[PDB]
Amino acid sequence: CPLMVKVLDAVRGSPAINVAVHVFRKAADDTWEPFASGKTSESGELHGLTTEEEFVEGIYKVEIDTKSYWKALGISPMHEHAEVVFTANDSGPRRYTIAAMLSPYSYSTTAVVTN
Amino acid sequence: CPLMVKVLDAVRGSPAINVAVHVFRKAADDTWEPFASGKTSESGELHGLTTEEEFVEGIYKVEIDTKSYWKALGISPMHEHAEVVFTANDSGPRRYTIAAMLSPYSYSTTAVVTN
Amino acid sequence: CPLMVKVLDAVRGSPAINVAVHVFRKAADDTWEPFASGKTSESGELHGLTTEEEFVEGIYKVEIDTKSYWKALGISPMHEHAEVVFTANDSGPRRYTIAAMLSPYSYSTTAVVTNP
Amino acid sequence: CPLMVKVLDAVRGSPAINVAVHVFRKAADDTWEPFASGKTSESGELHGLTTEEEFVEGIYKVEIDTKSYWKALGISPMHEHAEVVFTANDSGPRRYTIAAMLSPYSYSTTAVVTN
Ligand SMILES: [Zn+2]
Ligand SMILES: [Zn+2]
Ligand SMILES: [Zn+2]
Ligand SMILES: [Zn+2]
Ligand SMILES: [Zn+2]
Ligand SMILES: [Zn+2]
Ligand SMILES: [Zn+2]
Ligand SMILES: [Zn+2]
């Protein structure tokens, strides 16, 4: 995949499974245009988001839906999404893995960019 | 102080000093409206951004300018900003501290919400 | 302070309050010798750990006791401490703040090293 | 795999490749006994460290060697290792994945424990 998203639940120490993910790309008119979406697999991973051809250069936002992921803990999180914005592919082709370690009031995210 | 932003340089182990922070609030037309702005201090801290009265419930985005901040490292970062989005207030006065520990291809952020 | 420790609860979005912290310094014979201890304040901070004089150069370990901090959540964490090791003071004096963002199965820590 | 380690370079946005990892187990005399070793792959991963039979309950330390790893960067890190300690395997086998996002003065680590 040119783009993969991996989400871990840092509270329970498990992949975050069946979590909805929306990807957007910044359009000419400065709006976020929907790009790809899905739900995480059993390994916390969302593969098959885009194709080489479709994954053009631009600014991308990854939105991971957390609103009620935390419901069973009794905690309302800091925001309904965990969001990460990255600027893509200005030097040839790159594949991107956006990895996110999520808690209700904190998250760590790393973009791994390979060629 | 309803809203404080603290930015740390995780590569150099130092406050991120004199770094521009823009705060926005999600507006009626779904765009981000400029809400408050400042530059981090020698302690990497940004105080006096807003007032209890201006800081109503809503969805806020903290945008930390990182474009050229690691020029001197010779690394172009994952994106020209570090962005943290949080949903505010609900009940009545809540004080927010958004702490970000920044690296070019990563970040960790925690929202500390008190009384 | 030559050394300060700040601990945040990443699950509840709070300072982690009244949490025990042990600091060790690696001894000549390659054991951790107790250095300082205490519990975090209402701001998640532990001040007055050491002095200028006592904070000699060396390898230090900070243990933050987390075992039952999580109890009320119904979660047993990855380890009974969150631990950070750092190498201290290799030129002139430096002040160190160790900041830790903790969850049961994850943490992020940053050492902020400034010269006074 | 009972124990897998994955290391990401948060400064360059890559896997941490060819990095030495030493695993220890807390021994009877309270010292750290050498338990397993390897070097991370091209994908920042370290597999085949131990077997289900050797990996009994106990306290384990994962030591990632970072001393000269950002020297090209011109940065001496907070410590010559990144260390993660976890308490293992109350019950029967669990698979552990220790994921570590490393910067010179900072790191984020998550233990993913699965059945
Ligand atoms: Zn894939
Ligand atoms: Zn800005
Ligand atoms: Zn203030
Ligand atoms: Zn941006
Ligand atoms: Zn102090
Ligand atoms: Zn080692
Ligand atoms: Zn494996
Ligand atoms: Zn070490």
Q: Which domains does chain C carry?
A: 1-116 (2.60.40.180)
User: With helix as H, strand as E and coil as C, how does C12-39 read?
Assistant: CCEECCCCEEEEEEECCCCCEEEEEEEE
Declared resolution, Å: 1.9
User: Per DSSP, what are the bridge partners of residue D112?
Assistant: D97
Contact D36, D46 (CB under 8 A): no
Least Cα distance to D97 among A99, A14, C81, C109 occurs for A14
**Beta pairing class for D58-65 and D20-26:** antiparallel
Token couple for D101:
């996002």
Torsion, CA D113, CA C84, CA D64, CA C107, rounded to 10: 40
Residue type, D49: L
Contact A2, A8 (CB under 8 A): no
D108: helix, strand or coil: strand
Least Cα distance to B8 among B47, B50, B41 occurs for B41
Q: What is d(CA B19, CA C21) in angstroms, rounded to the nearest whole number? A: 32
Q: Do D13 and B101 touch (CB under 8 A)?
A: no
Q: What is d(CA D20, CA D18) in angstroms, rounded to the nearest whole number? A: 7
Q: What is d(CA D64, CA D21) in angstroms, rounded to the nearest whole number? A: 4
The label of the residue with tokens 């019950």 reads: D91
D48: helix, strand or coil: coil
Q: Is C76 on the interface with A (CB under 8 A)?
A: no
CA A27 to chain centre: 18
Token couple for C9:
């609860």
Q: What is d(CA B63, CA B8) in angstroms, rounded to the nearest whole number? A: 14
**Main-chain dihedrals φ then ψ at residue D49, nearest 5 degrees:** -60, -40
Least Cα distance to A63 among A24, A92, A106, A91 occurs for A24
Q: Do D113 and A15 touch (CB under 8 A)?
A: no
User: With helix as H, strand as E and coil as C, how does A37-97 read?
Assistant: EEECCCCCEECCCCCCCCCCCEEEEEEEECCCCCHHHCCCCCCCEEEEEEEECCCCCCEEE
Burial class (CB within 10 angstroms; exposed 0-12, middle 13-18, buried 19+) of B96: buried
Contact C81, C104 (CB under 8 A): no
D91: helix, strand or coil: coil
Q: What is d(CA B100, CA B110) in angstroms, rounded to the nearest whole number? A: 7
D27: helix, strand or coil: coil
Which value, in Å, is the radius of gyration of the alpha carbons in chain D? 14
Q: Is D111 on the interface with C (CB under 8 A)?
A: yes
Q: What is d(CA B115, CA A53) in angstroms, rounded to the nearest whole number? A: 50
Which value, in Å, is the radius of gyration of the alpha carbons in chain B? 14
Count other C-beta atoms under 10 Å from residue D14's C-beta. Answer: 17
Contact A28, A36 (CB under 8 A): no
Q: What is the DSSP letter of A114?
A: E
Q: What is d(CA A106, CA B14) in angstroms, rounded to the nearest whole number? A: 20
User: Per DSSP, what are the bridge partners of residue B7?
Assistant: B100
Q: Which ligand is nearest to the CA of C85?
A: 8
Token couple for A94:
């790159």
Q: Which residue of C has its CA nearest to D84?
A: C83
Gaps in chain D following residue numbers (C to N > 2.5 A) = none
Q: What is the DSSP letter of D30?
A: S
The label of the residue with tokens 């006791």 reads: C65
Task: Measure D8 CA to nearest chain C CA, in Å.
Answer: 14
Segment holding A28, helix H or strand E = none
CA–CA–CA angle D17, D22, D25 (5° rounding) = 150
The answer for D 42-71 residues in CB contact with A (under 8 A) is 44
